[PDB]
Design an enzyme around this catalytic site. Sequence first.
Site, PDB file in Angstrom:
ATOM      1  N   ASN A  13      -0.388  24.077  25.650  1.00  0.00           N
ATOM      2  CA  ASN A  13      -1.313  24.607  24.627  1.00  0.00           C
ATOM      3  C   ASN A  13      -0.752  25.811  23.846  1.00  0.00           C
ATOM      4  O   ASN A  13      -1.463  26.387  23.019  1.00  0.00           O
ATOM      5  CB  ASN A  13      -2.655  24.989  25.272  1.00  0.00           C
ATOM      6  CG  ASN A  13      -3.281  23.854  26.028  1.00  0.00           C
ATOM      7  OD1 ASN A  13      -3.629  23.974  27.205  1.00  0.00           O
ATOM      8  ND2 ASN A  13      -3.397  22.706  25.374  1.00  0.00           N
ATOM      9  N   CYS A  21      -1.428  37.746  27.004  1.00  0.00           N
ATOM     10  CA  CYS A  21      -0.286  38.259  26.273  1.00  0.00           C
ATOM     11  C   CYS A  21      -0.030  37.148  25.239  1.00  0.00           C
ATOM     12  O   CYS A  21       0.094  35.969  25.612  1.00  0.00           O
ATOM     13  CB  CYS A  21       0.929  38.459  27.178  1.00  0.00           C
ATOM     14  SG  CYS A  21       2.485  38.746  26.280  1.00  0.00           S
ATOM     15  N   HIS A  36       0.035  28.720  25.083  1.00  0.00           N
ATOM     16  CA  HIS A  36      -0.438  29.959  25.680  1.00  0.00           C
ATOM     17  C   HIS A  36       0.566  30.329  26.777  1.00  0.00           C
ATOM     18  O   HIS A  36       1.188  29.434  27.364  1.00  0.00           O
ATOM     19  CB  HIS A  36      -1.819  29.737  26.311  1.00  0.00           C
ATOM     20  CG  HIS A  36      -2.922  29.663  25.308  1.00  0.00           C
ATOM     21  ND1 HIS A  36      -3.519  30.804  24.817  1.00  0.00           N
ATOM     22  CD2 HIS A  36      -3.467  28.588  24.696  1.00  0.00           C
ATOM     23  CE1 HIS A  36      -4.416  30.390  23.931  1.00  0.00           C
ATOM     24  NE2 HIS A  36      -4.417  29.068  23.826  1.00  0.00           N
TER      25      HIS A  36
END
Lengths: 264, 264
Positions: B185, B222, B187
Site C-alpha cells: 500500500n 512515518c 506505507h
Amino acid sequence: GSLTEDGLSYKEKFVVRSYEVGSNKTATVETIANLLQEVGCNHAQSVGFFATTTTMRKLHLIWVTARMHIEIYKYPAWGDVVEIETWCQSEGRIGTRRDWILKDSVTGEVTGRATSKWVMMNQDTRRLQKVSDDVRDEYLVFCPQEPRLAFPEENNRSLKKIPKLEDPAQYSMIGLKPRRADLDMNQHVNNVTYIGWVLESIPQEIVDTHELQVITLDYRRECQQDDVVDSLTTTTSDSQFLHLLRLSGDGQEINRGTTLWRKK
Amino acid sequence: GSLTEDGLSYKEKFVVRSYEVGSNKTATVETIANLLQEVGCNHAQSVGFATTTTMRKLHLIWVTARMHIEIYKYPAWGDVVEIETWCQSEGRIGTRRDWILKDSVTGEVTGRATSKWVMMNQDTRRLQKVSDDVRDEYLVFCPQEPRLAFPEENNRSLKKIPKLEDPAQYSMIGLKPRRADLDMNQHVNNVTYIGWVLESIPQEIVDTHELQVITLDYRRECQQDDVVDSLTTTTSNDSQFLHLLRLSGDGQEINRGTTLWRKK
Ligand SMILES: NC(=O)c1cccc(Cl)c1
Ligand SMILES: NC(=O)c1cccc(Cl)c1
C-alpha cells in the site's frame, strides 16, 4: 530444496510472502535477489560446505561477488510458488560463476534468469587472486563439466562493460546508510542492499509506470557499517539508466550499474 | 499453512533463511516480526479476507496501536519454526491478534506475541470504536472464550510506557525509509519501526546480550519523505531501555517503547 538427480545443480520452491511484494502485488527485485542468495546457500550446504573449501579456510580465502546480472520476464505474485534452479561453473583461474533459472511452478515457464561472477579474495588483506590448482580440484566435482549458461547468447547484456557516470547526475538520493537489518551473519552489508540503494535514485514516475526488466551491477568495494552512500542515476535512452554508488564524503566508487525498464 | 480443526486459529511452518539471521546465526527480531505479519495475512486470506464488507464500504482499516513480543529462543538458520495465530474481539475498543511460536522438532514454546489493533478511517486518519455491524462480521472467526498469549495478572504486554526526556543517553539521527521499507500500500512496514528503535541500542549490548522483550506503541506514521531520530536511555544481569522515535525536524512523536535484554 534438493540437489537434482546428477548432483550438479540444486532446486528450491518458494511461496511469495505479503511483505516481499511491492505496489504491483508482485515480488520486488530485492526479494528475488534474496531468494537467489538463499538457494545458493542451500546448494553449498547440500554438497558439504562462508561457503569455502578446505584449502580456502586454511589460507583465509573467501568468494566475493564481482558482478550480478538479473533479467525478469514476470515477477511472481503474492502467494505464487516460484521454483529456482542453481548451479556453479569454473571459469578457469579467473574465478567461478553461479547461474540461476526462475520458473512459475504451475506453468513450468521460465519467468527469469540470473548470472553472477565471483572472485577469490584474502578476507584479511582484501587482495584478489587467481584460483589455485588445489582449490579448483576441491570444487570442480560439484560443477558440470560441459558449459551450462543461463545467458548463452553471444554478445549478451550479462557481459557488457559499464562506464562511470559523470557529474552532474540527472537524479540522486544522498545520505543512504545501512542499518542492522542490512548486515549479514558476518556483519558485512548484504549484497542485495546495494541493489536497493541503486534503485533509490530512480524517479518515482518510472517506478509507477514501468517494470524493471534488467539490472547489471558491478561490485568494486564494500560499504562499511559506518559509511554513508550517495546513489546517482542518469537516463541513457523502454527506459535505460546508468547508475553509480559512491561514498558520501570523498566520492570513492563502491558500485556501478545499468537498469532497463519496460512500460507497463 | 492451515486453519486448525475448529477454524478459530491458523498454523504455519517457516524454515529460517540465511539472510534472516544476525551475528548469532539465529533469526533477528525483525525476521520474527515479519513472520508474525505473514502468518496474520495467511489467516485472514484463509477465512475470506484485511477488512470486512462494511469496513471497505466505509473506508475503514485496522491499524496497529501496540506490538509486544517475547522471545525465549531465537530459531537457528535452517530450523523449522511453527507459529499459531488467532484474533479476539476486545469489545468496542478494537481487536487483539496473538501468536505462539514453537520449535517444530521439540514442540517447546520458544516465543509469544500480542498486538492491539484499532479501527481508523483510511482517508481522514480518525479513530473510532468498533460498530455492532462490523463486529458481527468478524466475530464468527474469533474464539468466544478468552484465549490469551499473555494470560499473567500483571504482565509486560499491558504496561504503560512513559515519554523519554531529553537528553537521551544514546541516539541514531537521520534514519530514512527506502522502497524496500514500504508495503504493497506504499506505507512504511510496521517492522521497520522495530529496526529503527534497535538502531540506538549500543553495539556492546547487541554483542553481549540477547533481546528478550520488546513492547512498542504506534502513535503516528512515518511518511515516505520523513526523517526519523531514534532515542534510547538505559532504565536499569538484565538491561532495560526506554525508547523514542520522533520526526527529525519538529520532534513530533511517532513511537515509544521498551526493551529488556539478558546477558548471553
Ligand atoms: N562455494 C564453493 O566453493 C562452491 C563451488 C562450486 C559449487 C558449489 Cl555448490 C560451491
Ligand atoms: N481482518 C479482520 O477483520 C479479522 C478479524 C478477526 C479474525 C480475522 Cl482472521 C481477521
